[PDB]
Amino acid sequence: RTTFTSYQLEELEKVFQKTHYPDVYAREQLAMRTDLTEARVQVWFQNRRAKWRKRERWSHPQF
Predict the structure, then answer these.
(1) In which residue ranges does the UniProt entry place its DNA-binding region annotation?
(2) Is residue 29 within 8 Å of 18, Cβ to Cβ?
(3) Using CA atoms, how far apart are residues 60 and 37, in angstroms rounded to an integer?
(4) How many CB atoms lie within 10 A of CB 27?
(5) DSSP secondary structure string, 10-54?
(6) Radius of gyration of the chain (CA)
(7) Which domain covers residue 37, as residue numbers?
(8) Which of 1, 29, 41, 43 is deepest in the core (most CB within 10 A)?
């Protein structure tokens, strides 16, 4: 549908840890392994990059 499964969110996040900016080869390989379309992978990484930067925007040393 438009939700992701649990395994999908695990493997999307695994890639994001290695590189915040997967190129076409990585994104294609992800879409094959998880049965998503390339377009949905691409958008998910645009979304996940903007989440990382929303969290950096008020990052502070932790107590």
Answers:
(1) 1-56
(2) no
(3) 36
(4) 19
(5) HHHHHHHHH-SS--HHHHHHHHHHHT--HHHHHHHHHHHHHHHHH
(6) 13
(7) 20-53
(8) 41
Within-domain flag for 3:
no
Number of domains observed in the structure of the chain: 1
Residue 62 belongs to some domain of the structure: no
10 Å CB burial of residue 45 (0-12, 13-18, 19+) is: buried
Among all chains, which residue has been given the structure tokens 């438009």?
Answer: 2
Structure-determination technique: X-ray
Q: How far apart are CA 61 and CA 8, in angstroms?
A: 32
Backbone angles phi and psi of 39, in degrees to 5:
-60, -40
Task: State the distance between the two ends of the chain, measured CA to CA, in whole angstroms.
Answer: 41
Q: What CATH number corresponds to the domain at position 34?
A: 1.10.10.60
Cβ pair 39, 28 in contact under 8 A: no
